[PDB]
Amino acid sequence: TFAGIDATKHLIGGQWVEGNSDRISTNINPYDDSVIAESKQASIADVDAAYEAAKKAQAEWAATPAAERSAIIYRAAELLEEHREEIVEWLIKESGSTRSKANLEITLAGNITKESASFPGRVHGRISPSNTPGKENRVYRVAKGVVGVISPWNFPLNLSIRSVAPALAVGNAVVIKPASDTPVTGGVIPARIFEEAGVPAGVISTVAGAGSEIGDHFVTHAVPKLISFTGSTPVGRRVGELAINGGPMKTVALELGGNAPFVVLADADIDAAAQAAAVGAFLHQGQICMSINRVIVDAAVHDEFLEKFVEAVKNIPTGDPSAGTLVGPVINDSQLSGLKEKIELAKKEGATVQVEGPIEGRLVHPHVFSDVTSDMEIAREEIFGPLISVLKADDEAHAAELANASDFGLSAAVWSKDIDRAAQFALQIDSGMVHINDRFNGDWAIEEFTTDRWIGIKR
Amino acid sequence: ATFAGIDATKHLIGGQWVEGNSDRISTNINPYDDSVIAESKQASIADVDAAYEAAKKAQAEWAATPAAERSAIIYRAAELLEEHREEIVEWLIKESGSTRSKANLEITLAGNITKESASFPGRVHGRISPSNTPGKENRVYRVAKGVVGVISPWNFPLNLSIRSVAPALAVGNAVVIKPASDTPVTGGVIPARIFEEAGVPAGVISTVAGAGSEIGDHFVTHAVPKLISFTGSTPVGRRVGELAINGPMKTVALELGGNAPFVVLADADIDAAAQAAAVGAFLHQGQICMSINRVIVDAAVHDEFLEKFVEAVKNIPTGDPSAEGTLVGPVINDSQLSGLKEKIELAKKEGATVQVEGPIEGRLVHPHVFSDVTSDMEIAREEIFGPLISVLKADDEAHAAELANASDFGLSAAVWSKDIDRAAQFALQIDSGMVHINDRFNGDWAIEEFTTDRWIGIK
Amino acid sequence: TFAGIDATKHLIGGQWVEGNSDRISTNINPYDDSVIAESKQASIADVDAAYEAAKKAQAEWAATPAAERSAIIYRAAELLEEHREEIVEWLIKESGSTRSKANLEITLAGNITKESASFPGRVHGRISPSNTPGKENRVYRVAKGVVGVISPWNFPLNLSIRSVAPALAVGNAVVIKPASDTPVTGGVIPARIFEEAGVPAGVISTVAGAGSEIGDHFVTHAVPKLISFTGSTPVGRRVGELAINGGPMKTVALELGGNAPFVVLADADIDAAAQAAAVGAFLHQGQICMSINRVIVDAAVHDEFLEKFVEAVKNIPTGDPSAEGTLVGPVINDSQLSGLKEKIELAKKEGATVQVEGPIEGRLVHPHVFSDVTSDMEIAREEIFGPLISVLKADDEAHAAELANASDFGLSAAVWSKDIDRAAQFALQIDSGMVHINDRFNGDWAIEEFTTDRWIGIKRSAENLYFQ
Amino acid sequence: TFAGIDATKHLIGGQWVEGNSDRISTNINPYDDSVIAESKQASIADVDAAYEAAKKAQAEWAATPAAERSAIIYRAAELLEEHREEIVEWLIKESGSTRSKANLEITLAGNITKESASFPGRVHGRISPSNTPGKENRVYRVAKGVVGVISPWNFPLNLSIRSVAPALAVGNAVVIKPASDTPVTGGVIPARIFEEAGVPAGVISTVAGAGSEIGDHFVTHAVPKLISFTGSTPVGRRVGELAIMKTVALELGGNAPFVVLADADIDAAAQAAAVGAFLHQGQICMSINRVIVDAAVHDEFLEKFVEAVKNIPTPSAEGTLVGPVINDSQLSGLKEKIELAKKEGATVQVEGPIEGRLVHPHVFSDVTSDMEIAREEIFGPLISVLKADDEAHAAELANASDFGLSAAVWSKDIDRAAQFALQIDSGMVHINDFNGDWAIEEFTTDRWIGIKR
């Protein structure tokens, strides 16, 4: 259960109901394998009801005055704190998250929701200039309509609120489809938080189900105007294809965390950078916008940084997430293999082990690898686990090439005392976000969940 | 074969007009009489690589060029559009089978877009956002995408290539054009040459014309372009979207002029609307921002409109495009002729009634109008690309709204109603980026589409 | 007293202190003449203290994270809503507001600040395009610095907050100089309420004194870089003039609600327009952006509208402010009283027709209506600030626009006409910032007003310009 | 005469006419005292006509299609370079500006009106959110109406077009009243060039009257919604006061600071102080009347700087960099300022002759903040070099003067430089070195129309 209803149901038509599918998925605590629950998953006829109920209820929502919608969204943020401990526990249980990680995730979901509540009072269309006598060009800024959000298992609550909150505050009706492993932290909870906040029936909905049964059908559907996806790149591609291959076509917003880079230039404060890289590599692992899985260091400070970086990660306790742990267990037994495979492959491709830990159950301990090249799989591919490569750049220009060598969407970080030069270097990296010496953009968000409707009026 | 002096069979690569390298020989045929215009050796995969490579090397300096400087060159190309008017008209008629008067409208259109584009350099700005962390400063820079790949259509080659080419170049992008194999000079050589003669540095503008499929895929699939602009058919746009997702992703902008509706409401000036529908359906076909392919009239005025409309379209001179009176020219090629032929047959087999028909000799398809059509019929739910019209009856106001949203794609739509205010509300009920009441390039939309925002946080 | 601090004190430096001038102020209830309180006023010295304190504290406040400044502003809205009953009683006792009018004022005050809480994260600067190779143009949007706010006796709470809240939220430090008749509702409550929400010491202040020794010096001081004024246009003009030739550099934002025209066109919903006119003229008078001082009606529907408007005005409860039904209370003071008595007579001795009029029992002026008036009668061209309304006859649609603009007060105007598309075109002819059709605080304009832009152009040589 | 038309007439109601004032003015070449021309001055009734006609012709011009307005404004930029040499002479002989300084002003003039030609398309309104059930909020952005522009004698062509072009493009009707000493460079030429460009009759006007007659009537007139003034801080003040019912925009040039921080490429910066002190004299945006330097590079800066100013040659010539002063009243002002400078203790680091109206460069040193030479607006080639004990002093010293549209700061640490720059209350600050979006705002007003459906 959660906040007053059993976390195994689905919020369809504003009614918490049981799934009509034949499949029954068993949610397993990644740490000790204890059954958390068993729910009758949803069928396509259920997704249909979800979407159709959203379409039918969306207009009245979009038409609700700015202040109202704002107040409700703001209420949701209050509720996030008011149910904090119950949410922390679920984060620990289902997501295999650490007590401290869960705490962060909730604060983060609350900042996004807090910003998002100002959105109503920020959506503006414009009155364009006319080129033909008697013509009035008005471009209204409206809600896209119905958004289908597909949340991941890494930061289930955080990365889902990242799109549910702005999408709802702006007038859209949303339908969440969480990852198989985290259906309540990535779907039931955020859904419930907004229902409890006042979001009208049909506006917020959640539908969980097996990939092979509803995955495709959720994207290819005719109701959603926008599909927001957060996950791994190969799955993003598939959702991307599906959105344009017989739908009709709908906009698809892909949040593909990949192999993010942490560049340390020659004039960087190796001390702070060491500390920082340790936080971004493990304490924030899973969070697509702050996580990093490879630090690129200049040759002139490489040996020093590597030294300090290793002595910093050896002190990262790996254990029972319920505890001072800072790195809990991996999510699936499928996710466990993959990591195992990458550790080996790095060793096999000639990488150098710098920090290795035991692997008990799904409790993978940190792993560091120096002497890594941009062509090694460990660096090219997406990791999503406590794996960490250290590549050497013998030139500042080479650092930029190393940083762009692997695909990654979200963020990139760089350390350098020369704020001005670093800022210039940052522009030399292909990322929409680059942070120097240490998020969520509201403007970028209101634009992603609204559409501009140009209405030409000839008098 | 020549244009503005230059050999028209060559390709502009690395700032140098050269002959293609593939063994494939393409013969350009006049659509109206089958006389050969030219015979150009096609561009090979290697040629596309050179174009993208050289373009990528010259882009930075072009992007570093002062705003006023870039805008002077964009304004010059607009003057050049006019100075070369006479000759572009001949090419438009000769290659794309355009009517002489249609050709003159297209050129006015093109030049009107690049003059508007001329003001873009001084309109591109970034933000300095507030921070939430002490001592942090957020600066989001608005820069060029880098290299932009432009695929243009055979319908309004000049005007639709320019629609992307001009703003992209204006904003700091370097661009490579891959025109439709039927209109390589009106869609590639002429646009490319106007900007070259206007002074955009070598390598910043290029055209590479090649035989479809493989070269087409390579062109979209390449690692250099960070944007692929496409205007054309939906099955092809679909394919471009696929390739952009599989086979190093890049944003893809698709301009698919599907089946645009022309909505006539009960209180509409039927005579005006009728004349307007005639203009949009036949004198503007091919221009996917002003054309319409189906009419939706309120029952209460369906018969009045139909008769008044049938009258109007029966007075449209079909025939040789060179003649100044003509308004309907030939269809671009035999294949397109086949689709038009079979679409007509099918409309009949589906239950449609012929209201206006004529003989089709050569590639000269006379205007056709069907009545008693339903939204499930393909004559009204699929792209048309030819002088074929459908008229659907709307027994209800809200019903008209349904039929208007019955098709897949749509750039614009139009509504007719004397009640200016109620019409504006109605228009909002249509899912189309553009809707014109009682009578089309968005500068802002073009800046956002051809630039990329870089958020850079500093501590 | 008000929420733990005695209303008689001034908030300087972050501390509620007693005044230092020798002049002693005596608060008087406009409905009965009670001594609400008596308190020593602030001297020219207390104004300097407040400004200097605000000046030094300003920067850290501006540097506070946006979300943090935002939470502080948001809570002020909550506290405003919390101390509702107390503020209500205070509005009625001092400003002479009505039970229900005071309650409306607080809602208004509340909405404004919850809207302002949104401001910190909305304030942004720009990176403009460059025309000279190697040059970067940044244009920062920052706080003005210190803002002095002069609040009026009409809607003291709502009109002070209208500028105090966005200014604070945006990073300014602000010193309030309330109207002499309403020092607590116009200064103490809003200051205290922001203090109890969390704004730092020195960032919010309230210096109250007799304009006689404080007024001019407040506007003239060298610290404030913006003066916000709300009141009569005469005083407003004096403020403006004083700001241009005193402390060389400081802008002024004058909010002068003079004679807002309420225009009823040929095709209006005369019955709805009638009730609305009634509302804007009495329940809302004092409220700068909502009230109306004159109504102009197309001749074709003039007499029809007049008959119905007079009816609704006739049945408007006038009396004791404390009562929950009253809609019109006493005038703030005798000076204003004698100003209205003078205006009613002047309208008469100019040939105007009385439609409605009542007794004037102890500062309690009953609603007064005058028809058959023309654009040059003082009653229809000067500002009123009282329950006196004048109806003018318009020959046609075009004459309506001309009658509407016969003022010099363009702050807001209302227009009634069933035809929306044309009424909107018509509204464009009126010389006001805002016009409302068939029945209002702009946040965007507010942030522009309390911030300043700083263009910083930086040229980089080859030396400190990399990867070029 | 200019570009055909009679240069002594006043464009009113679209027609160039002779003034109705019984006062005549003899426009005199500041350089040699020769009489360029004489003209019947404009009267109060003349002004009323120019404004009354402008008002009637405005609504039509604003409703003119955006791309149309933009082609007209653009044309004016072509006409400006077509009449280039003809205008160069007028600044040369009337404004007393050199040949290099005149040419520069024409390009700058061109740039402004060319940037301004893109304004019609960039003027957007807004459809704000609604808080009341079923209400729409439209915020139209319209032209103010009629704009009274008061240009000055320093850079009369550039500083008049600066207001005029943006205000016209946007759809306002403008009436220019130029400085008594420059009625054609600051009034006739700009008005005549927009006329040829295509601006309708009554949309552009120029009226040259006597300060004592027209001066006050031009500002307090009911018609103009905006008054754009450019000049000395004291006269800018009366204007604003007189204006208070319409809004006024004061471009008050005073004493712009040139701060040279301890790590400021003392050499290349000394080269720039020279340029911003003489080459860009009349330029209220590119000129500096004082240099604040940190003790460390103080003497280092001064030497190279003195040698810089000493090399500046001394109108109709090519080499010449500095020209004569506009009039006698101004001349006596500089001299008067030069003397009390010495009487205050300042060291005459540099001093040149005073042949006629031509004042040679003057540079003083060991100057402090409580001296009129660093406090008052100078309007002449008089430089003051103040020493700053540190950087904190530099901030104080920089903000000392009451008026400042722009400032300059040289450093090497671009980042710290930027930070320091924000500590100087000035609209503009340039580091080691015309805003359109702000001009668009200035010549338009936002009209909020709320509709309860």
- Number of Cα atoms under 13 Å in the Cβ half of residue B11: 27
Q: Do D81 and D110 form a contact (C-beta atoms < 8 A)?
A: yes
Residue with tokens 């048309």: B384
> A121 touching C, CB under 8 A?
yes
Please pick, among A255, A381, A382, A448, the residue that the annotation labels catalytic: A255
Q: Is the peptide bond before A133 cis (omega within 30 degrees of 0)?
A: no
Beta bridge partner(s), residue B228: B149, B252
Q: Which residues of A touch B445 (CB under 8 A)?
A: 452
Structure tokens at C357: 């009029």
* Dihedrals phi, psi of A127, to nearest 5 degrees: -105, 100
* Residue C446 vs residues C140, D220, D327: alpha-carbon distances, Å: 17, 28, 45
- Read off the DSSP letter of residue C369: E
Distance between CA atoms of B229 and B252, rounded to whole angstroms?
A: 6
- Out of D122, D124, D129, the one facing A66 most closely (by C-beta) is D129
Same domain? For A419 and A451 the reply is no
Instruction: List all chains that touch chain D, counting a touch as 3 or more CB pairs closer than 8 Å.
Output: A, B, C
Structure tokens at B31: 């659509």
Largest Cα separation within chain C, whole Å, is: 83
Dihedral, D112, B128, D120, D78 alpha carbons, nearest 10 = 20
| Amino acid in the structure at residue C377 | M
Same domain? For D341 and D203 the reply is no
Distance between CA atoms of B291 and B261, rounded to whole angstroms?
A: 9
Contact A439 B433 (CB under 8 A): no
Q: Give the distance from residue A189's alpha carbon to the nearest chain D alpha carbon, in angstroms.
A: 29
Same domain? For C278 and C376 the reply is yes
Same domain? For B421 and B450 the reply is no
Distance between CA atoms of A152 and A257, rounded to whole angstroms?
A: 11
DSSP of C69-118, one letter per residue?
A: HHHHHHHHHHHHHHTHHHHHHHHHHTS---HHHHHHHHHHHHHHHHHHTT
Count of H-run helices and E-run strands, chain A: 15, 21
Q: Which residues of B touch C124 (CB under 8 A)?
A: 127-130
Beta bridge partner(s), residue D138: D127, D449
The total of structural domains in chain D comes to 2
- Number of Cα atoms under 13 Å in the Cβ half of residue B361: 6
Same domain? For D236 and D123 the reply is yes
Same domain? For C85 and C167 the reply is yes
* Dihedrals phi, psi of C5, to nearest 5 degrees: -125, 145
> A417 touching D, CB under 8 A?
no
D417: helix, strand or coil: helix
Q: Do D76 and D193 form a contact (C-beta atoms < 8 A)?
A: yes
Q: Around Cβ B33, how many Cβ atoms within 10 Å?
A: 12
A60: helix, strand or coil: helix
Instruction: List all chains that touch chain C, counting a touch as 3 or more CB pairs closer than 8 Å.
Output: A, B, D
- Out of C140, C142, C433, the one facing D448 most closely (by C-beta) is C433
- Look at residues A226, A125, A220, A120 and name the one whose alpha carbon lies nearest to residue A168: A120
- Buried/exposed C1-22: b ≥16 CB within 10 Å, e otherwise: ebbebebbbbbbbbebeebbbe
Nearest chain C residue to D142 by CA: give it. C428
Please pick, among A105, A115, A195, A289, the residue that the annotation labels catalytic: A289
**Which residue in D73, D118, D124 has the most chain B C-beta atoms within 10 A of its own C-beta, making it the best mutation to test that interface?**
D118
Same domain? For D441 and D300 the reply is no
Beta bridge partner(s), residue D28: D35
Beta bridge partner(s), residue B453: B142
Strand order in the sheet with C173-177: C15-17, C10-12, C204-206, C173-177, C146-150, C226-230, C251-255
Distance between CA atoms of B340 and B293, rounded to whole angstroms?
A: 13
Q: Do C308 and C271 form a contact (C-beta atoms < 8 A)?
A: yes
- Buried/exposed D47-74: b ≥16 CB within 10 Å, e otherwise: bbbbbbbbbebbeebbebebbebbebbb
Interface of B with A in 221-250 (CB under 8 A): 238, 241-242, 245-246, 248-249
Same domain? For C105 and C173 the reply is yes
Same domain? For B349 and B421 the reply is yes
Q: Give the distance from residue C107's alpha carbon to the nearest chain B alpha carbon, in angstroms.
A: 29
D280: helix, strand or coil: coil
Structural biology method used: X-ray
> B418 touching A, CB under 8 A?
no
- Look at residues A438, A377, A459, A447 and name the one whose alpha carbon lies nearest to residue A125: A447
A40: domain CATH number is: 3.40.605.10
Q: Which residues of A touch C122 (CB under 8 A)?
A: 118, 122
Q: Around Cβ D31, how many Cβ atoms within 10 Å?
A: 18
Dihedral, C160, C166, C167, C171 alpha carbons, nearest 10 = 150
* Residue D61 vs residues A162, A437, B166: alpha-carbon distances, Å: 48, 54, 29
> C456 touching D, CB under 8 A?
yes
Structure tokens at A43: 């069928």
Asked about A289 being catalytic, the answer comes back as yes
D253: helix, strand or coil: strand
Distance between CA atoms of C52 and A405, rounded to whole angstroms?
A: 56
Structure tokens at B372: 């008693």
State the Rg of chain C over Cα.
Answer: 24
- Look at residues B418, B456, B451, B409 and name the one whose alpha carbon lies nearest to residue B437: B418
Distance between CA atoms of B177 and B165, rounded to whole angstroms?
A: 8
Same domain? For D429 and D355 the reply is yes
Same domain? For D213 and D119 the reply is yes
**Which residue in B120, B132, B419, B422 has the most chain C C-beta atoms within 10 A of its own C-beta, making it the best mutation to test that interface?**
B132
Same domain? For A227 and A271 the reply is no
Q: Which residues of B touch D114 (CB under 8 A)?
A: 68
- Look at residues A327, A275, A282 and name the one whose alpha carbon lies nearest to residue A99: A327
> B428 touching A, CB under 8 A?
yes
Contact C444 D412 (CB under 8 A): no
> D252 touching C, CB under 8 A?
no
**Which residue in C127, C139, C460, C467 has the most chain B C-beta atoms within 10 A of its own C-beta, making it the best mutation to test that interface?**
C127
Nearest chain D residue to B69 by CA: give it. D111
Contact B119 D114 (CB under 8 A): no
Please pick, among C82, C89, C255, C448, the residue that the annotation labels catalytic: C255
Residues of B recognised as catalytic: 255, 289
Contact A121 C467 (CB under 8 A): no
Range of the domain at C394: 258-440
DSSP of A326-361, one letter per residue?
A: SB---S-HHHHHHHHHHHHHHHHTT-EEEE---EET
Q: Which residues of D touch C459 (CB under 8 A)?
A: 430-433
> C455 touching B, CB under 8 A?
no
Q: Around Cβ C234, how many Cβ atoms within 10 Å?
A: 11
Helix runs in B118-176, H state only: 157-171
A308: domain CATH number is: 3.40.309.10
Resolution (A): 2.6
Contacts of B26-29 with C-beta under 8 Å, sequence gap 24+, read B26/B181, B26/B184, B26/B209, B26/B211, B28/B1, B28/B95, B28/B182, B28/B184, B28/B185, B29/B333
> C437 touching D, CB under 8 A?
yes
Structure tokens at B450: 């051809």
State the Rg of chain B over Cα.
Answer: 23
Q: Do D232 and D379 form a contact (C-beta atoms < 8 A)?
A: yes
